[PDB]
């Protein structure tokens, strides 16, 4: 009865020379039973990409919300959500609901389209913001990913460098923990063209 | 805390240690437990130092509202104003509060505040952990219509003990005179009172 | 973490570290502790993160429409009241361990405030899981009639003993200085004494090394 | 009530090679936020060979190394000072441990040699006894992080060769004693950055036929 | 399974060029009450010995009959009691350490935290922790308690690693234990201001100082200090 | 309640529901059918705690049969699936939640596609091939992981669905009575009344 | 708060028409941490005996070694190898000694004797001791249930069984998170046992997928 | 391990025991025999903890065993199940009692009658008609009540028998893979294969 | 309880207040928790009672076996034998008690012993519930080489504060004086001691 490791998965986000890669595993389950093999976790509102762990209901359930919210921001401000101000936001909501939170590892990725810097980010379940430059982690193979991260990570990748990079953080990561793999998804984005692969795990 | 208030002849004299723990830590060495509510009506806190704060400042608040409106207030309205918050909210406070002023027809004045929120005139006062190691020396020693200097040493005396047999008090001794003349801070460093 | 501060002959000193903390694993190796309620009115942080981000914020921004208001620029003993109000009001349950320190047509001030709303003033706080071991060092070097390069070194110091002895703190040490009658410096990574030093090896994999399973281009346009 | 165990930290890694085997571990010693020591050696050298650690809780940790140290001593005497293999010091450290199967030693042991061939071994045990051969492994705080790190670059998991479509795997090899302590120390200085409980100082102790050699590195110390 | 009743606090010490220091407060607390002032915490076995304990007092009173009974054990039979076979500090601590890791096995634990410090025959010095868990550790500094978070960050500014030791003398060593004991008596609601003091050197051997005083201190900053906040009275 | 089991084959949904209902020590109905029509070409079945299984069922049948008369049209059983999870999502924090895992197995008209979804108590939606709720899914997912193939008929997906009942009936402790099978397809739903 | 301590393995042993099929997974977990991807849950106790490992890795796998042991001196004082019945009734024996002390056990003692024929005797740490043809046991036990039952027939091939206990544990591998790694096959005769091969499940799984076109859940 | 009744009648003792064998969510074994013959003419059936059960059955087998050597000769039902409960009465106070409870049935060759002990785990010893073990009773007694008359054959006892276990398969909430049945007469011990 | 033992020129004296409570009810006012385990060697009991009769019996038991076969014991002995079934059975054991002697050649001493098991050789001693009231007062007014008239006052006046502000203690305070003169005992009733 712990929400935040029910469901299993995880999410990575690196950023790279002029790009940014943002991935997740396809896993959902109930404890030890596998239910499902095709749970995407990353989600994106124009070019501003969105990953969210935990809780699955909570998962679709802000997927939802910030589909709204973002819809709603477009209409009124007449142009695209960016990176920047949709952390914010995610952060207020999050922290909106302080005594009674969703219980969820969200991470943000994309690249600014006015000044076309890479960006991430990363919160806890109240909406406290974790930027990075390098990289950020989220699931239940945390720690086996910040320790995939650390050693595997260089600064300025190409993104067909980057893409392998990533790739490799997060297999390897999700081979050591039992509720995360089950196949996996990477985006690799450019300031105008966004690629998404799935890569080949094994299924246990 | 070691805290106390004692009447005397010319009014009213506050006295306390200076220690703020959390547990075996001292958070502040040089705390101020000695606050003001009004000019000359004081008050001693023990126990929560968010809880005492808080409700001293209520007090503050409530007692300046009532000197735009109708005046000075006495010190027994202090005290009950301090009663109706501690004892209202007794479930959710932690709060031993001396209550101490001085007005021109009652001279000094001391109420004393227990958790309950049971409101106790008396001659003189003492809370905090570190009082209960002292009822028998202030109960010798203590009497009415004392001197300045008298009171002070009494405080001081006593205090001393308290601060060196409870391990949540000490620091340097603060003490606050009332009298007609105004009022006067002191403070009473280790040097001088641990070798009494 | 570590958070210190300082008062000096002209104005106040605050520092803090850059480590940040999920259990026993480093979240974040550099993350800003140092906030702006106004412009020379800053705070440092230590407890649960996203509560301390969030109150500052709320009373920043309170503090910015009284400013408006008044048509005064703002206290230290404005924020101090209604942070402490605030926090109190939550019985603790925001986890907010508070070193508030400024500027304003008063003078200098230096407060601490704690998550269940008790506040202190000092020359020399220190707040967050290495505060015995800043508090040690300010307690052996503080004196009175410091200067502004002395409150520096000095609030360094203790920032530093934390990041060496505590657990809970580490990485890096950020500064913000507030004078009477000059603008609050704030000194982002003023020290970086925990540079990591060069890989044995790099892991560039060659390309092609995964394996793959479908390509496909996803639309972000509209 | 009292509570018999405690966490002292750190971290630990075994890594064999051909005609070798290295067990590296952190010096770092800690208890809650505060460190101990930045130096207290947690690999020794138990004779025949034989390098072990017992990392977790260093108390129980201490009394199995001199446990098994001595189990050696009177392994020569009981059979005409017969040198002690790894596999059979292997079984004996299982029965130690299981020895107290309901009042467990509180650690993770990782012993490191040549087999009888001559080639690389390193063992790994639970708590209460079970054990298993291994190319690698990581125990302690910090084995999650190492861990899958080791899988990628020592086993070449996850790897394919380059352009034959993820269908024939990067071939296994031996690696030389240069290229595993380059993975030592990257693997250390990785887990440094990222977990609190591991820092200070790395040190590793080779084994080959000609005996067993030390190296020590500094790490980050915050 | 116990609870401690009458309690010492922190034992702080560390290593220079010559010897070590050690040093601990002369009270024995009992919960807030600060019980018992007379209380030495510093006991020495030998002239090359000083076994520093904090905790529980009556398990601390335990440990020096044992110590006391093992000084009478080694001289029987034993020509060479005075010179080669008298007393290390390292066979004193591996026993202490034997006795604590027993004790702690058999869920009856001597609630202390001790520091055994001292300079062995071959001039090397000896510094080594042990607790009720058996938990054994070395450090060119080591405290217990309080000393722990404050005195160690303090007395490794002045010997961060091994090669701070020749550097360090023994004037400069003392100033920072003293220095610590100051600090410790500012910050623990359990501390008092009377303490011991020990020097082992390899020249001068064993000096033992009784009845230091924490002195030098910083009060009167305190005066200036009015409220918790608005207040200006 | 306790086993219900979805197969969505090539051209319809087929949904097998448990029969008992236990209270107790005592089996007191051999013959309950855990399942409710929401709409022609719509089925839900559901099982968990007492009471708020029907009265969760029966609420949402209200509510989409209020819908279609409003605007005279039948929702996708996307759309129906998605409007189901939200009432369970409010739920899950509410004062007292809803204890019910429901499948919605349905037929889409204008995609004349079958549709399976599978969302618990929490809110929890994925859309399969195969599910089951409960200790079920222990046994019968590895089975139609075997088994199950996606051009599949009707005749087939009954056939493999019997594979299912007769495993769990081998190795699951408890009598549940046998299974009432629903079919959904571009014709509606129909119930197989020899099984 | 307590240790975490490995546990695992799911294991399977059926009897048929050629012997016995003997087959189990390879991961060995402590909580939701993937501890091992290469344990040895089976013991070769003799060329005759085996013994599967499940629930506490280090209560099986000492028990087990030591069960070898008792089976040795067995053959040593009677001049003739033990029987099926008497190895399990040992090793039943004693876990029952140790009833409530908390020792974790799911094991199959399988093998062939003369007097007995091919022989599986199931026996768990509460002391049950059941003989029988078909036996799943481990936290993926059902997921292997599930496709072991449904493809069980007394007249299978030599071929066609080994494969189907490869393909159960494959299955159980798959939906069971706690379950992987790797299948170790085994094939008892008249003869003794026979050892089939260690199978990682990173190449197994597609292998199967492909040939069998099972898996149609999986993203191809 | 749930299920044990007994039926006393004219000239034999009939027992019925449980064949299922379950631990989770799997029945492991669907071929139980919870019987041990203690000596030719007495029979005792068992269902209690997992292991005790037979562990206490062995253990009270070996000893009647020993007995009949020993003297040459067979004990009556009645000593077997005063020895059987003094075993059970010692073990409740023992360090870990023996959580099994127990039918005895017999037929006594110097009386020529048949005889049925129920003991419980207690070591609660009653000679009765009918007995049975666990939430069996609770069906199977009040059956009993009506249907059972004290003259009548094993013939008639066996389908009053499966009067009880159609009851039992009817209402109870587990499935216990029907039972294996065994009378015990003057001629000794034999088992009825089809039931 | 309130109980203490006070050296002097002398020798020492042992004083002690009379009242035995359960809970709120006093099970008996005029107890004598002043108790002899040698002609010249007693005790002050606090804790409880069963404890400390039961404590009390087996070192009267030791010592008179030790005075069988190696003389009179010293008042250190005397405490060592306490300390030796407070210390080893402290899990099982709630008594405070105060050892107090009188030699020849160490004229006269107190040992005080607390629920650890722990020894304390002191000038004089104090312990039991309502010894905490008395910390200050005993502190300030102690000094050593006291007469015998002065000790008693001293004693007098610190356990009737004691039992003023106690309410486990109370009744009579029951006092031995240990010299080389011999053994005396002294009581002091409420009509007395209250009224100082
Ligand atoms: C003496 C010390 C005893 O009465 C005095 O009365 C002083 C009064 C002055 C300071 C006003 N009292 C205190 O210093 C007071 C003691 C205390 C402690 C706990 C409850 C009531 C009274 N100390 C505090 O209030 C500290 C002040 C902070 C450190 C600046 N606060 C705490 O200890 C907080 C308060 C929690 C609380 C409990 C119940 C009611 C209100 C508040 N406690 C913690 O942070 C807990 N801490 C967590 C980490 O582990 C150690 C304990
Ligand atoms: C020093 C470093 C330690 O005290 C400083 O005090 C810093 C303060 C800086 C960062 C402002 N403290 C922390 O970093 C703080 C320590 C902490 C942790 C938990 C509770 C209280 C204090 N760390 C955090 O607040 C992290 C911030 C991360 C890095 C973004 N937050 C968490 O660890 C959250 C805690 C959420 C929380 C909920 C309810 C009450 C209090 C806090 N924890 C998690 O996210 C863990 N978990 C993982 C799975 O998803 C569900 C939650
Ligand atoms: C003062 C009073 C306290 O410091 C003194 O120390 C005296 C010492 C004298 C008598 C030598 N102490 C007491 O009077 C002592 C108080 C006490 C109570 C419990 C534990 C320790 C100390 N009182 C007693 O020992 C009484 C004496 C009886 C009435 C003759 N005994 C009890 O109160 C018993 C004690 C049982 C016990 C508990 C823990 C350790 C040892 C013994 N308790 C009860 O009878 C419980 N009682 C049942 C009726 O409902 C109310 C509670
Ligand atoms: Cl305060
Ligand atoms: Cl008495
Ligand atoms: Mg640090
Ligand atoms: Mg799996
Ligand atoms: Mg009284």
Redesign the interface.
């Known amino acids: 009865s712990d929400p935040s490791s029910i469901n299993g998965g995880i999410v990575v986000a690196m950023t790279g020379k002029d790009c940014v890669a943002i991935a997740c595993d396809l896993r959902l389950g109930s404890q030890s039973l596998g239910v499902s093999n095709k749970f995407e976790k990353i989600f994106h509102y124009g070019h501003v990409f969105l990953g969210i762990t935990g809780l699955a209901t909570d998962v679709t359930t802000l997927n939802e919300m910030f589909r709204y919210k973002t819809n709603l921001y477009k209409l009124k401000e007449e142009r695209a959500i960016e990176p920047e101000t949709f952390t914010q936001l995610v952060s207020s909501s999050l922290y909106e609901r302080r005594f009674g939170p969703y219980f969820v590892g969200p991470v943000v990725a994309g690249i600014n389209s006015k000044s076309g810097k890479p960006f991430i980010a990363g919160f806890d379940l109240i909406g406290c913001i974790d930027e990075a430059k390098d990289f950020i982690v989220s699931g239940t193979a945390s720690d086996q990913l910040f320790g995939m991260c650390e050693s595997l990570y260089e600064p300025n990748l190409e993104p067909e460098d980057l893409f392998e990079t990533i790739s490799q953080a997060l297999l390897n990561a999700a081979d050591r923990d039992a509720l995360s793999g089950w196949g996996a998804v990477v985006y690799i984005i450019k300031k105008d063209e966004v690629v998404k692969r799935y890569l080949k795990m094994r299924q246990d | 805390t070691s805290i106390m208030a004692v009447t005397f002849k010319d009014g009213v004299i506050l006295g306390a240690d200076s220690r703020t723990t959390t547990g075996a830590y001292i958070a502040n060495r040089v705390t101020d437990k000695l606050t003001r509510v009004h000019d000359k009506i004081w008050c001693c806190r023990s126990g929560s130092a968010a809880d005492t704060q808080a409700i001293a400042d209520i007090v503050q608040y409530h007692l300046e509202l009532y000197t735009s409106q109708y005046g000075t207030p006495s010190t027994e309205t202090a005290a009950s104003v301090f009663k109706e918050l501690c004892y209202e909210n007794k479930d959710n406070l932690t709060a031993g509060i001396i209550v101490a002023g001085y007005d021109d027809k009652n001279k000094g004045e001391v109420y004393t505040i227990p958790l309950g929120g049971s409101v106790h005139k008396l001659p003189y006062a003492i809370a905090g952990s570190g009082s209960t190691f002292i009822y028998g020396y202030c109960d010798k020693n203590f009497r009415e219509n004392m001197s300045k200097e008298e009171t002070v040493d009494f405080i001081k005396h006593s205090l001393s003990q308290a601060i060196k047999w409870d391990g949540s008090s000490g620091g340097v001794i603060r003490m606050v005179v009332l009298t007609a003349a105004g009022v006067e801070r002191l403070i009473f460093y280790p040097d001088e009172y641990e070798q009494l | 973490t570590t958070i210190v501060g300082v008062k000096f002959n002209n104005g106040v000193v605050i520092a803090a570290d850059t480590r940040s903390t999920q259990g026993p694993i480093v979240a974040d190796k550099n993350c800003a502790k140092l906030h702006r309620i106004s412009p020379k009115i800053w705070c440092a942080g230590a407890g649960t993160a996203a509560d301390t981000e969030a109150v500052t914020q709320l009373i920043g921004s309170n503090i910015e429409l009284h400013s408006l208001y008044t048509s005064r620029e703002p206290r230290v003993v404005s924020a101090l009241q209604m942070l402490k109000q605030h926090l109190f009001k939550y019985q603790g349950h925001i986890g907010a361990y508070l070193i508030v320190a400024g500027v304003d047509p008063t003078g200098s001030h230096l407060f601490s405030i704690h998550a269940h709303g008790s506040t202190d003033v000092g020359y020399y706080l220190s707040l967050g899981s290495g505060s015995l071991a800043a508090m040690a060092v300010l307690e052996s070097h503080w004196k009175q009639d410091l200067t502004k390069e002395e409150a520096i070194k000095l609030a360094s110091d203790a920032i530093q003993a934390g990041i060496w002895n505590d657990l809970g703190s580490g990485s890096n040490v950020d500064v913000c200085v507030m004078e009477i009658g000059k603008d609050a410096e704030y000194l982002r990574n003023y020290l970086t004494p925990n540079v990591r030093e060069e890989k044995q090896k790099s892991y560039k994999f060659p390309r092609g090394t995964t394996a793959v399973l479908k390509e496909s281009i996803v639309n972000i346009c509209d | 009530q009292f509570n018999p165990y405690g966490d002292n930290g750190g971290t630990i890694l075994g890594i064999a090679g051909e005609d070798f085997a290295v067990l590296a571990g952190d010096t770092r010693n800690i208890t809650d936020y505060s460190i101990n020591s930045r130096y207290e050696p947690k690999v020794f050298d138990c004779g025949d060979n034989i390098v072990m650690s017992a990392n977790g809780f260093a108390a129980d940790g201490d009394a199995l190394v001199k446990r098994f140290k001595n189990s050696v001593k009177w392994y020569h005497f009981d059979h005409n000072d017969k040198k002690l293999s790894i596999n059979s010091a292997a079984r004996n450290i299982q029965h130690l441990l299981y020895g107290k199967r309901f009042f467990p030693y509180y650690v993770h042991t990782i012993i490191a040699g040549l087999d009888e061939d001559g080639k690389g071994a390193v063992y790994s045990f639970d708590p209460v006894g079970s054990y298993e051969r291994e190319q690698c492994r990581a125990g302690g705080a910090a084995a999650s992080l190492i861990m899958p790190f080791l899988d990628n670059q020592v086993n070449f998991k996850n790897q394919y060769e380059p352009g034959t479509n993820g269908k024939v795997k990067k071939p296994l090899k031996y690696l030389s004693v240069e290229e595993v302590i380059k993975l030592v120390r990257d693997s250390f200085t990785s887990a440094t950055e990222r977990h609190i409980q591991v820092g200070d100082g790395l040190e590793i102790l080779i084994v080959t036929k000609d005996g067993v050699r030390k190296e020590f590195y500094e790490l980050k110390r915050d | 399974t116990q609870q401690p009743i009458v309690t010492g606090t922190s034992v702080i010490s560390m290593k220079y060029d010559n010897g070590v220091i050690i040093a601990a407060d002369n009270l024995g607390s009992y919960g807030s009450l600060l019980r018992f002032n007379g209380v030495e915490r510093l006991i020495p076995v030998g002239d090359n010995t000083v076994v520093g304990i904090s905790g529980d007092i009556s398990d601390m009173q335990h440990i020096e009959r044992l110590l006391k009974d093992l000084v009478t054990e080694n001289a029987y039979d034993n020509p060479l009691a005075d010179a080669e076979e008298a007393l290390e500090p390292s066979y004193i601590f591996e026993y202490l350490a034997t006795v604590m890791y027993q004790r702690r096995s058999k869920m009856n634990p001597l609630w202390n935290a001790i520091i055994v410090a001292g300079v062995q025959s071959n001039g090397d010095q000896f510094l080594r922790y042990v607790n009720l868990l058996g938990v054994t550790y070395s450090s060119p500094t080591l405290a217990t308690g309080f000393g722990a978070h404050m005195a160690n960050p303090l007395l490794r500014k002045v010997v961060d690693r091994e090669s701070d030791i020749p550097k360090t003398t023994v004037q400069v060593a003392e100033e920072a234990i003293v220095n610590a004991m100051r600090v410790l008596y500012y910050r623990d609601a359990r501390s008092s201001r009377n303490f011991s003091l020990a020097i082992i050197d390899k020249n001068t051997g064993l000096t033992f100082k009784k009845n230091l005083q924490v002195e030098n201190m910083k009060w009167d900053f305190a005066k200036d200090i009015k409220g918790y906040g608005t207040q200006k009275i | 309640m306790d086993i219900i089991l979805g197969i969505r084959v090539q051209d319809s949904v087929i949904l097998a529901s448990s029969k008992a209902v236990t209270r107790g020590i005592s089996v007191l109905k051999d013959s309950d059918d855990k399942t409710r029509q929401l709409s022609p070409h719509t089925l839900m079945s559901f099982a968990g705690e007492a009471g708020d299984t029907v009265q969760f069922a029966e609420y949402i049948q209200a509510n989409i049969q209020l819908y279609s008369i409003r605007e005279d049209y039948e929702l996708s059983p996307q759309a129906v699936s998605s409007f189901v999870r939200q009432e369970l999502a409010k739920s899950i924090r509410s004062r007292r939640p809803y204890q019910v895992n429901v499948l919605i197995g349905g037929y889409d008209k204008k995609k004349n596609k079958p549709e399976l979804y599978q969302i618990d108590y929490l809110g929890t939606k994925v859309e399969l091939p195969y599910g089951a709720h409960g200790y079920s899914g222990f046994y019968t997912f590895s089975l139609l992981d075997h088994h199950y193939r996606p051009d599949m008929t009707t005749e087939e997906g009954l056939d493999l669905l019997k594979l299912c009942v007769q495993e769990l009936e081998k190795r699951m402790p408890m009598d549940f009575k046998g299974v009432i099978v629903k079919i959904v397809d571009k014709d509606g739903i129909r119930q197989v009344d020899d099984f | 708060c307590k240790?975490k301590?490995?546990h695992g393995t799911t294991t399977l042993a059926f009897r048929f028409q050629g012997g016995i099929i003997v087959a189990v997974d390879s991961?060995?977990?402590?909580?939701?941490?993937?501890?091992?991807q290469?344990?040895?849950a089976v013991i070769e106790i003799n060329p005759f005996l085996l013994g599967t490992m499940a629930g506490?890795?280090?209560?099986?796998?000492?028990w087990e070694t030591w069960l070898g042991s008792q089976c040795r001196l067995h053959e040593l004082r009677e001049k003739e190898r033990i029987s099926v019945a008497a190895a399990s009734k040992i090793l039943?024996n004693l876990v029952?000694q140790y009833?409530?002390?908390?020792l974790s056990m799911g094991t199959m003692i399988c093998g062939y004797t003369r007097k007995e024929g091919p022989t599986i005797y199931?026996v768990?740490s509460?002391?049950?001791?059941?003989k029988?043809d078909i036996?799943?046991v481990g936290?993926g036990?059902?997921?292997?249930?599930?496709?072991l039952?449904?493809?069980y027939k007394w007249d299978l091939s030599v071929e066609d069984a080994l494969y189907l206990g490869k393909?159960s544990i494959l299955?159980?591998?798959?939906?069971?998170?706690?379950?992987?790694?790797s299948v170790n096959l085994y094939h008892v005769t008249e003869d003794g046992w026979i050892y089939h091969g260690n199978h990682d499940?990173?190449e197994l799984?597609?292998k199967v997928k492909e040939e069998?076109?099972?898996?149609?859940?999986?993203?191809?």
Do not use: M, P
Not at chain 7, 141 to 147: D, E, I, L, P, S
């Open positions: 240790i301590i490995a991961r060995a977990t402590a909580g939701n941490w993937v501890a091992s290469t344990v040895k506490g890795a280090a209560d099986c796998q000492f039943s029952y009833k409530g002390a908390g199931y768990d509460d002391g049950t001791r059941l029988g036996f799943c936290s036990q059902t997921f292997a249930y599930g496709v039952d449904s493809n393909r299955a159980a591998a798959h939906r069971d998170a706690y379950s992987g790694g499940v990173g799984f597609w069998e076109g099972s898996f149609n859940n999986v993203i191809g």
